[PDB]
Symmetry: C11
């Protein structure tokens, strides 16, 4: 598992506490919903778990030289299902926001859904660092 709950507007990772961050103001338009896929593309941990759990389910059939074939088939047929499952428990739902600043410049930012509802027409304050931004309501 990967704990991608540090991608909300209500939780800070501990490597950015006790630092300085700048402040700007803006306005909000055109929110639409979006899905977020964390983790890594080459799933390795799922493969090994699936492989062992599928292989040890193979010994219990047959006997002789027909048992080795069963365990060998079960190994790969569980290995692929491991990657099948390990990349469907790392999928959350978020929103995409288009904010227009008071400078006159427009940007958009994507952020995980929490327990506050964003609406078209509102005032937000941007807490920013070098290439990092958090958006919080009024």
């Amino acid at each position: 598992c990967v704990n991608n709950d540090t991608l909300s507007g209500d939780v800070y990772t501990a490597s950015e506490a006790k630092q300085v961050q700048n402040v700007s103001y803006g306005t909000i338009v055109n929110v639409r919903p979006v899905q977020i896929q964390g983790g890594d593309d080459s799933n390795v941990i799922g493969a090994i778990g699936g492989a062992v759990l599928g292989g040890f389910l193979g010994n219990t059939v047959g006997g002789g030289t027909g048992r080795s074939l069963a365990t060998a088939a079960g190994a790969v047929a569980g290995g692929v299902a491991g990657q099948g499952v390990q990349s469907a428990m790392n999928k959350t739902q978020g929103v995409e926001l288009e904010i227009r600043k008071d400078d006159g410049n427009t940007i958009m930012v994507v952020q995980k859904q929490g327990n506050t509802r964003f609406s078209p027409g509102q005032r937000v304050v941007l807490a920013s660092n070098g290439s990092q931004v958090t958006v919080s309501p009024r």
Copy 2:
């Protein structure tokens, strides 16, 4: 398997959440369909799976010194089929779009087919970063 579903216009990888992205506008012409081939060219994981599953199907014929020949032949004849199959499950279908911006400059971008249909003559908004672009309808 490789999870190339992060190449759509409705799914964001989690390493580009909580960042700033610029906004432009444009118009759409000349969409045509295209196929997309993910993964890597040197298939290694397919070779080993094919090899073991083909080798363990060789012991069950013959006996003596004619069993070793059977298992040795089965090993390679399954090894090549492993790469044959592992590079036909990583093939998806997408579209290629030619968008003309309001600057007066023309570009084209290629993107995976989803559940929205693009048509000739429409307004799109480009969300851009340094050498990254996502296209979404009006």
Copy 3:
């Protein structure tokens, strides 16, 4: 465990004693509560502890070739719970402060809750270094 108690306004890590730090003054507005998530995202130590403690609970059922299946299942079903638990004991509660300096510039800083209560309207003194800040009351 990770000892993230060095993120308070009353405890200094020992690698920043006997050094020089600058002093500024400011005023405080708009405190709101926030949670803090320490540690690292890829939980490794939890996985091994969960795995061993789940595996050694598997031998005590069944016998023959039905014991191996039980221990193999218990191993992974404890492995995932290890990461489930090891990333819920590293979660503390803090505050977020917006301070306006006497220069005329505005910043905000996030800091762990202690035993002093911050209120809207107060005088604070910032002890600063290069990209490090501690806030302490009057």
Copy 4:
């Protein structure tokens, strides 16, 4: 095997989707046919497969100390044939095109044969990147 089907004008590798590419126009003259040789020059995978399959065909003759000689001879006499065969299944047929752009500058590009026929006298559109080009008909 090497999957050199990403060298056509109808298939895009997945590492160049969702990017920006420029557009130019031109005219076509002097197409002639050409062969294309993929892969790598030092064939290693063919050698091992040929070696094992030739060696295990050696035990079945003779007995005593005249069996070792047979297996040793078969090993190398299959090893060289492995490289003989593994570099004749990576050979495709393509075309070479000489296109004159509307700038007044002339270039030529080589590309794999597909299912569309190029003729002398036609209009093509070049989709280009930094040192990458794809040619597609009108």
Copy 5:
């Protein structure tokens, strides 16, 4: 253990003897007490000691296959307590001083409590190097 007694105003580490250090003068205001946490955040030595001492307390109960479960549980239940204890014996008490120099510039420095008492209103002499300072009374 970590010997953090070289963080006082009466003990010099031996890698800064026979060197040259500059001298300044100042005045002292606003001392307040503070705690100091040495060592390192990832406690490793505590984990192994706790693990072995907890594991060898497990064999003495039960017998058969119920002994392995006891030793496995004791191992982790002592492992976490090892880190619990090894990071509570590296905690000392010090003071924080705000000194105003004769230049007209203000700084503050934090230093371990010894056997001399600092008071508001006094003369101190700063012995300094590049980014190192020791404060000693008149």
Copy 6:
């Protein structure tokens, strides 16, 4: 073996497909025939093959302590012949051409013999890259 058939004027390596190449014109004079020696100077693969095939031909004579001498002699007397043979199957025949460009500058290039005959007095077109050239007839 080394597959040096990518050194002709009718076969392109697959790492230079879908790229841009410049075009020039010229005239041809003074072709003379030449031999080409591929591969590498320190022959290693030939040594091991020769060594094993010569050594296993030594056991079949004599017995006692006079067999070890025979196998030891055969090993080296086959080892040197391995390098003798492995560097006589990598030798092809090509031509050397002196072409005078329309600029007024003269160069010469060497290229493997194919199935087209070059003659003194003819028109050729040079397809060029940075320090790469292919010559093809009119």
Copy 7:
């Protein structure tokens, strides 16, 4: 042990013999006594010695499965005492001197106590190198 007797004003390390050193003059004020702590903070050699000497004192009590517990407890209870003792035999006594040069500039230097007594009001000669100084009486 660490031989920190090369930190006196009467002993030179052998890597700074046969070199050139500059000469200055000064005057001496305000000597006060100080302690010096050599060695390294992470004590490793003490831990192993304490561990072995404590462990081999554990076998001599009890018998059965109650001997293993005794040796395991003795190991750690001697391990910590090893670091307790190995960092109390590397502690010497020295002096701190404030010397005012004839330039008009003031410095202070710290140096191990020997067999000569420094007094307030005296003439000293500084033998100096790049960031190295030795002070010797008249």
Copy 8:
């Protein structure tokens, strides 16, 4: 063995085919014969071959503890002869030529003897690259 036949005026190494080379003209004077010594100075492959072939010729004399002495002596007395012989089969015969160019500048180049005879007074054409030259007759 080392195949130093790529040092003639009639054989090209395959890493310099399909490249561009410049052309100059000159005249020839003062050819004299010279020997050429290829390979490497520290002969390693000869030592091992000589050592094994000399050692296995030692067992066939004597018996008891007088056999070990014989094999040990034979090992080194064959080892040195290995380097004696392996550096006398890498010695060829060539010529040294002094050519005066039409610029007015003089150079000389050394090249292996082939099947063409160079004479004093003749016209040669130099095919050159960066610090590489081949000389061929009219």
Copy 9:
């Protein structure tokens, strides 16, 4: 042992023979005696010798499980004495000289005592290199 006899004015290390060195003249004042401590601070070779020689003196007392305790105690009680002795045989006696050059500049140099006596008031010649000096009498 360390052979620190190359620190005299009558012995040259062999890495500075056949080189060029400059010559200057001067005068000598204020010689005083000094001790020199060679070697390295972390004594390793003494520890192992002391450890083995102390450990093998432990077996000769007692028997049973009271022999292991004796050998374990002897090991460390000889280990520390090894470092005690190995750093008292690398201590020589030298002199420190203050020489005033004819330029008008003053320096001092430290050098091992030999068989010539230096006196206040004498002429010396300095043989110098880059940051190396030897002093020899008239």
Copy 10:
């Protein structure tokens, strides 16, 4: 052995064939004879050969525990003689020449004796490269 016969005026190493070298003229004065010492200073190959050949000559005397002493003594007493002999077969005889060029500049070069005699008063031609020179008679 080291084959230092490539240091004559009649043998070229094969890494400097087919290159360009410049030509100068001069005159010869003051030849005197000199010895040349090749190889490397730390003789390793001689030590091992001497060691084995001396050790295997030790078993043939005595018996019991007096044989081990003999073999141990013979090992080192042959080891030193190995380096004694291996550095007396790499010693050749050469000449040193002082040549005055037609520029007006003087140099000298040292070169191995061959089969031509140099005399005072003669004309030589220098074939030169960057920091390489060969001298050959008229």
Copy 11:
């Protein structure tokens, strides 16, 4: 052993043959005798030889557990003597020369004694390179 006979005025190392060296003239004054110490300061090869030869002289006394003590003592008591002897066979005798050039500049150089006698008042010629010099008589 180390062969430091390449530090004379009559023997050239073979890595500086066939190179160019400059020539100067001078005059000679004030030769005095000096000793030269080659090799390296940390003697390793002597330690092992002394250790083995001393250890194998220990078994021949006593029996039981009193033999181990004898061999252990002999090992170190021979080990130190190994370094005692291995650094007294690398000591030669040379001379130090002060030469005044015709420029008007003075230098001195140190060189091993040979079979020619240098006297006060003579003419020498310096053969020089970058930071290398050899001095030879008229």
